[PDB]
Amino acid sequence: AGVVPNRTSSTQKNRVGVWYGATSNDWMETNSAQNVDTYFIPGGNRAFIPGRVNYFHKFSGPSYTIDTACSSSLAALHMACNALWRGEVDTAIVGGT
Amino acid sequence: AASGRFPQSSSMDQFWDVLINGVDTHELVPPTRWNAATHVSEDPKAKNVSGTGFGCWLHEAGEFDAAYFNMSPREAPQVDPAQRLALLTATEALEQAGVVPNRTSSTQKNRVGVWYGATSNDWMETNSAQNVDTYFIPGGNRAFIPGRVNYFHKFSGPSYTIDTACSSSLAALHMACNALWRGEVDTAIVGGTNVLTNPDMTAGLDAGHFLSRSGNCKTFDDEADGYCRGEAVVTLILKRLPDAQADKDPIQASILGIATNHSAEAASITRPHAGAQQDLFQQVLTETGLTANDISVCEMHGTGTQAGDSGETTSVVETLAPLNRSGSAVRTTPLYIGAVKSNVGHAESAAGVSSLAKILLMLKHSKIPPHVGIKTKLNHRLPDLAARNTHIARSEVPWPRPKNGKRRVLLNNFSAAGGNTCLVLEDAPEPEDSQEVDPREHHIVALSAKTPDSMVNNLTNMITWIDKHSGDSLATLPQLSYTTTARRVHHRHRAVATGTDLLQIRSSLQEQLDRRVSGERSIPHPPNGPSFVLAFTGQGSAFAGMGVDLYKRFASFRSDIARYDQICEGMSLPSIKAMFEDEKVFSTASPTLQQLTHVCFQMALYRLWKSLGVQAKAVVGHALGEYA
Amino acid sequence: PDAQADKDPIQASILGIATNHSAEAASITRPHAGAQQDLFQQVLTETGL
Amino acid sequence: PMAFHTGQVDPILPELLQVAAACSIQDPQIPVISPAYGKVIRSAKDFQPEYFTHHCRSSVNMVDALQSAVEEGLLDKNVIGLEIGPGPVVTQFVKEAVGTTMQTFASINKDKDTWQLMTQALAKFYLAGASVEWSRYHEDFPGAQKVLELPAYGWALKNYWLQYVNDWSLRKGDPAV
Amino acid sequence: KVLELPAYGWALKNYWLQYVNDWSLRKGDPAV
Amino acid sequence: GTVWRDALKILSEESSLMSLVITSRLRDLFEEIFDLRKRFS
Amino acid sequence: AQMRVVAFGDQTYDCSEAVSQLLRVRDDAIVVDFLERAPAVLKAELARLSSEQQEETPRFATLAELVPRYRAGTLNPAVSQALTCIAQLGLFIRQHSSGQEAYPTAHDSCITGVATGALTAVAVGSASSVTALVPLALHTVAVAVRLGARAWEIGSCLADARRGANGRYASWTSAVGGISPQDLQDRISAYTAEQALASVSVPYLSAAVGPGQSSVSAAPVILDAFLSTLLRPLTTTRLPITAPYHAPHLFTAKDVQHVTDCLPPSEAWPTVRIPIISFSRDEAVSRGASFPAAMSEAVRDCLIRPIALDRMAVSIANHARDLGKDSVLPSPIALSFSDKLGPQVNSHLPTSKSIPSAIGAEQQPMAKSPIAIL
Amino acid sequence: RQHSSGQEAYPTAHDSCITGVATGALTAVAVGSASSVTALVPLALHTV
Amino acid sequence: AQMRVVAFGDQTYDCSEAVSQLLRVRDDAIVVDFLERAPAVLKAE
Structure with missing residues (x-):
């Protein structure tokens, strides 16, 4: 999308949100659970899926994970569309995992 | 309305008892969850062993009525305690609030949405996972936490689960306010759950130096090594004020605004910093339209961390208690800051709603409870609160409401996932004129259950409750009358009692109870x-x-x-x-x-x-x- | 407005979207068609076609 | 003052017939026990204008209608009777028809109060298992309907739990040894 | 105008924690 | 009457998900107790 | 020397496409703010009602889920009334904020409306801006739902739901053609005399349309029976009017007073500055009346007086002459058979381009907008 | 706010005049060029 | 026959309190709409 943070008004860092649907974290239940360590909880909780994206690109807008089960992603899309609709964010990042 | 289950508390009233008596509820993990001898070690060396065992535990979390929510005895265990308790509290809140199926227009099918925050599904990872069966995903998936509330009560409105980690339920409150301000819903059901049966959650948190190996959250204490585990379940009922006044529903308080940002500028992925938090606090003050002086109390997200507490405190005082350039306080009235987490622990997902719940009782009883997070000495990193007229109440302080005025509060629920969310709250609208006695002389009380045993139980419990509250007020019987009748979700087997006063109600229920105890077999009368x-x-x-x-x-x-x-x-x-x-x-x-x-x-x-x-x-x- | 202002690429455009819950279901397992149909016309209204 | 269901009402029957003829008749949704005919009517064919003249002039045969009902199984001792009207005159007739142990009561009577008869009746009624929307019955008093906070409802709870056992979480990743 | 160009060339390595010894089938059972 | 006796237990353990399960267990009701008992004969 | 007339319609116009194309509006914030807000004042007055309304009350999540049950005929008069009113206000609020169209003024324009449109008309006539129209417009939403609601009270009382309804609500009104309103009135009177029917259950002439056109309302059982007696060359066509209206025998002044009880008493209510053409009365033109009084009067038009649509055209023209205007623009909003209005009004009597704006302004705002997937 | 929420009538050439100094001049142009708050808003954004 | 004059000021007047009170407007959507588009078009310029 050619997005460069703080290049234009719509791409300013504080106007950018993230929303991602996720049905489960099997990684921390099965794989990292065999040996728990310091980055177990940073690596396994669902909230870090959108969070990590905000931290890397320095987006100070909202961060959310949605679980409606098999509709999670469109539910997240709905929340994101609502944010653009109410002016809460200029740009919205929507995904599903 | 709000109902919930917290540590050493089966209701909001016993949580008032926890707070006002300065109770500190942390204790070693009970054996029902996991064995501390094998899972806890002074110095962990073996894998999946943690340095701490402590938490504040809902010891009744397993208690559930399979007959009330249409569940069999084989299905009910496999349901997560977050789901079961969410159903109980949500039901209770509907009984305390203004919502019954097919009553007014605010109660219709799709006009009632549900949002719940949840940061952990341990039930499906640990307990039901030993033997998987058909009701594994029916009982373990978080989407069914709001889902089941929609199926039983026949609420067809939206259904969402929010996971912002430790900010989850307040994030769900944000979503709820956005929908109430979109027109998608008017009745909104907001709650949060955090019931955990996995030791790995603990061990991973401790591996990350999140949890405190000494004790509970110590907010503001000079030696503060982390937060501590805590467990809660909440559900609230929310409505836009015009509709709430249209139905003359009860209103404990009114939310003016709520906002969310993220701490993007952080030097790490773990600690939220102060700049984003301050920008958020001022954002909500400007949005809702209030100065520092208008807010007299702030419920902080206190995790009992030296860095977190000092950082947040600086953002709060710099917003709500700025200092003049000369060095005099800008505040004319006192600020009282506190953290609920020092009592009932760090509920993580349910932390936001727990904090809000604290406010609802503080508002009701007109008092600020004591702050027990300070064990030894105040933290040296904190700014000079007394010069700014900020205070940590060590003992209870009178908190009276100004005449023809509303005191307003700032609440904070933040997450290690760096999202930051907070709201501004306000006292409820004054009555229309004043109190009035119900001109109805004779009243009707309705009791229900799906099983004769449950029926007997409800009869006994109602009689004991009448014996407790018999003489407090005359308005108890009209309130409980209109409430029991309209505000309840009843089932097939059902009992009735009438009278002028609570005594006649008791005599009737006692008579029926005697019929149940003596000369009644264990089978029901015909359910056709x-x-x-x-x-x-x-x-x-x-x-x-x-x-x-x-x-x-x-x-x-x-x-x-x-x-x-x-x-x-x-x-x-x-x-x-x-x-x-x-x-x-x-x-x-x-x-x-x-x-x-x-x-x-x-x-x-x-x-x-x-x-x-x-x-x-x-x-x-x-x-x-x-x-x- | 922001999209066209920044000369961003646009592959398509979402008119609208909606959500309800199947409360009238027999079971927790299977969503039923009445709610779904009401939701389809719900988005056809919200979107306007 | 007058004597109904006798030769006295003979002159009013033609005009009454026209009154009945200006009406709109539909099949009953539930059976009608008819004392006029001493029979259970499920069809609109029997409610024609002649019914109302016949009713006015003909005797009220409770015994034949009730006995007709019980023989069809529509009524028995398990069924609930409810008096909608002042005084329990008719319930006693139903009671005498089906059996002495049928639960039948009234609500509005001149001797006892409304609420007394009501608790004795409504108890036994809803004890039998019936469904209610109490909202429609109490949604009343636009100015006196003030609602305040009260404690929760008494719960009858049992412990449903799957015990975590054997400490298998510490052995995650290890084989069976 | 924005052209569709190749995505960033990633320097990729496999980062994985193998699930081993089928311990999920023995959930609830003792060591033995 | 044997199958009349067993079917009741098959009901008690379960009682449309449950319905399909009940009839599947018969082989191995939301739409189509006495109606059941008579449907056997 | 041209005068635009803003004409609103009744229940007959299908507003599904209307409401549909309204929530398409992303081009102004007051449209979406008002349309989203409409359920709030609506629900604020939806709760004070009887029990039977609480029985068959349909579900609707927003103003969207009403559409399928509207087309299916399974939507009640109270909500379908409010929905038509919302659609009319939404189209106006659109056209005059989104559409960059100036607001009506007493000099160059008048307002008119039929049944629901009368309520809508009071609101537009009482404001000096769209932004000032918004609150009055919502108060009108509440009036509309209480109007349809009370109509359904009495209508349900007269006749209950039919067995073969299956949730679909029958139409109390039908359009007749090939006969003059007076001659049809005579046929109604004759049918009344020959058949045994009550005084409240009688058929009546609900509207006078044209020299050979009119509309009659009775019960689906009764109306069917009456319409069965009218034989060709006469015409009979169904219409979606789901409650009895325009019946001075069924309703009285207390019902009007009650429908408007949702308007609190105050002295700051704006008056009707734009003249409203109320053609179904002795007084063709009414201006200056207060908003509550104007509303109660419009409610009385809906509930009590018959529609005289044969007097509408000339009524507009008379006022056009009063202000010395040669011709009129029609600007219909959700009006059934609106295309033929313009010629009809101009028969009694003897060109547009968009305005561009700043780069990014002529398009929609940055609040709400059809989100692009980049 | 004064002329919509405040329900204050919009200025007219007969009964009123507008003036401004520095910034006020620009804003004055905008208020002087509209008939109504609705017609003032686009000219308002232009003026910003 | 009184005539109202609408007088606007310059930078010398402190508009901090003004805008602080204008972000509080809710009753009418055009004010929050104007204050929504104003900073966006502002930063766009």
Whole structure:
């Protein structure tokens, strides 16, 4: 999308949100659970899926994970569309995992 | 309304008891969850062993009524305690709030949405995972936490689960306010759950130096090594103020604004920093339209971390307690800052709603409870609160509400996932005029259950409760009357009691209880949809002032009678409304008036009982009664 | 407005979207068609076609 | 004052017939026990204008209609009777028809109060298992309906739990040894 | 105008924690 | 009457998900107790 | 020397496409703010009602889920009334904020409406801006739902739901053609005399349309029976009017007073500055009346007086002459058979381009907008 | 706010005049060029 | 026959309190709409 943070008004860092649907974290239940360590909880909780994206690109807008089960992603899309609709964010990042 | 289950608390009132008595509820993990001897070590070396065992535990979290929510004994265990408790609290909140299925227009099907925050599903990872079965995903998936609340109560509105980690439920509150301000819903159900059965959650948190190996959260204490585990479940009922006042529903407080940002500028992925938090606090103050002085109390997200507490405190004081350039306080009134986490631990997902719950009781009882997070000495990193007229109440302080004024509060729920969310809250609208006694003299109390054993239990518990509250006030019986009748979700087996005062209610329920205890087997009376035949009498037995109480007390009935009267007057028939308004007319009243009064009385009365869902298998009528 | 202002690429455009819950279901397992149909016309209204 | 269901009402029957003829008749949704015919009517064919003249003139046969009902199984001791009207005159007739142990009560009577008869009746009724929407019955008093906070409803709870056992979480990743 | 160009060339390595010894089938059972 | 006796237990353990399960267990009701008992004969 | 007339319609116009194309509006914030807000004042007055309304009350999540049950005929008069009113206000609020169209003024324009449109008309005539129209417009939403609601009270009282309804609500009104309103009135009177029917249950002439056109309302059982007696060359066509209206025998002044009880008493209510053409009365033109009084009067038009649509055209023209205007623009909003209005009004009597704006302004705002997937 | 929420009538050439100094001049142009708050808003954004 | 004059000021007047009070407007959507588009078009310029 050619997005460069703080290049234009719509791409300013504080106007950018993230929303991602996720049905489960099997990684921390099965794989990292065999040996728990310091980055177990940073690596396994669902909230870090959108969070990590905000931290890397320095987006100070909202961060959310949605679980409606098999509709999670469109539910997240709905929340994101609502944010653009109410002016809460200029740009919205929507995904599903 | 708000209902919930917190540590050492089966209700909001026992959580007031936890707070006002300065109770500190942390304790070693009970054996029901996991064994501390094997899972906890002073210095962990072996894998999946943690340095701490402590948490504040809901010891009754497993308690659930399978017969109330339509569940079998094989299905109910496999349901997560977050789901079960969410159903209980949400139900209770509907009983305390203004929502019953098929009542007013605010209670319709899709107009009622549900949002719940959840940061952990341990039940499906640990307990149901030992033997998987059909009701594994039916009982473990978080989407069903709001889902089941929609299925049972037949609320067709939206259903969402939010996971912002430790900010989850307040994030869900944000979503709820956004929908109430989109028109998607009006009744909103907001809650949060955090019931955990996995030791790995603990061990991973401790591996990340999140948890405190000494004790509970110590907010503001000079030696503070982390937060501590805590468990809670909440559900609230929310409505836009115009509709809430339209129905004269109870209102404990009003949320003015809520906002969310993220701490993007952080030097790490773990600690939220102060700049984003301050920008958020001022954002909500500007948005809602209030100065520092308007907020007299701030419920902080205190995790009992030296860095977190000092950082947040600086953002709060720099917003709500700025200092003049000369060095004098800008505040004219005092700020009292506190953290609920010092008592009931760090509920993570349910932390936000727990904090809000604290406020609702602080608002109700007009008091600020003591702060127990300071064990030894105040933290040296904190800014000088006394010069800014900020205070940590060590003992309870009078918190009276100014005359013709509303004190407002700032609440904070933040997450290690770096999202930051907070709201501004306000006292509820003053009454319309003042208190008034219910002119109804005689009242009706309704009891229900799906099982005879449960029935016996509810009878006993109701009798004991009456013995507790018998003499507090006269308004107890009208409130509990209109409440038990309208505000409840009843099932098949059901008991009734009437009287002027609570004593008569007790005598009735006691009598019925004796019938249950003695001379009643363990099987129920027939559950067929218990067939009714309705018998309609002729005008022979009619008398003066017949059904005046029904005409003065019941509006649906009054509507029907008034309508029938106008229908009569337009057809060149006598006016029957007078017979119910005034009794003296019955002496001189003509056969047509007598007869029409009788038949109108019967049609209205039939419609009244049908309004109670009385399904008539058939009807019989004697002379004139058949017309009805 | 922001999209066209920044000369961003646009592959398509979402008119609208909606959500309800199947409350009238027999079971927790299977969503039923009445709610779904009401939701389809719900988005056809919200979107306007 | 007059004597109904006798030769006295003979002159009013033609005009009454026209009154009945101006009406709109539909099949009953539930059976009608008819004392006029001493029979259970399920069809609109029997409610024609002649019914109302016949009713006015003919005797009220409770015994024949009730006995007709019980023989069809529509009524028995398990069924609930409810008096909609002043006084329990008709319920006693149903009671005498089906059996002495049938639960039948009334609500509005001149001797006892409304609420007394109501608790004795409604108890036994809803004890039998019936459904209600109490909202429609109480949604009343636009100015006196003030609602305040009260504690929760009494719960009858049992412990449903799957015990975590054997400490298998510490052995995650290890084989069976 | 924005052209569709190749995505960033990633320097990729496999980062994985193998699930081993089928311990999920023995959930609830003792060591033995 | 044997199958009349067993079917009741098959009901008690379960009681449309549950319905399909009940009839599947018969082989191995939301739409189509006495109606069941008579449907056997 | 041209005068635009803003004409609103009744229940007959299908507003499904209307409401549909309204929630398409992303081009102004007051449209979406008002349309989203409409359920709030609506629900604030939806709760004070009888029990039977609480029985068959349909579900609707927003103003969207009403559409399928509207087309299916399973939507009640109270909500379908409010929905038509919302659609009319939404189209106006659109056209005059989104559409960059100036607001009506007493000099160059008048307002008219039929049944629901009368309520809508009071609101537009009482404001000096769209932004000032918004609150009055919502108060009108509440009036509309209480109007349809009370109509359904009495209508349900007259006749209950039919067995073969299956949730679909029958139409109390039908359009007749090939006969003059007076001659049809005579046929109604004759049918009344020959058949045994009550005084409230009688058929009546609900509207007078044209020299050979009119509309009659009765019960689906009764109306069917009456319409069955009218034989060709006469015409009979169904219409979606789901409650009795325009019946001075069924309703009185107390019903009007009650429908408007949702308007609190105050002295700051704006008056009707734009003249409203109330053609179904003795007084063709009414201006200056207060908003509550104007509303109660419009409610009385809906509930009590018959529609005289044969007097509408000339009524507009008379006022056009009063202000010395040669011709009129029609600007219909959700009006059934609106295309033929313009010629009809101009028969009694003897060109547009968009305005561009700043780069990014002529398009929609940055609040709400059809989100692009980049 | 004064002329919509405040329900204050919009200025007219007959009964009123507008003036401004520095910034006020620009804003004055905008208020002087509209008939109504609705017609003032686009000219308002232009003026910003 | 009184005539109202609408007088606007310059930078010398402190508009901090003004805008602080204008972000509080809710009753009418055009004010929050104007204050929504104003900073966006502002930063766009």
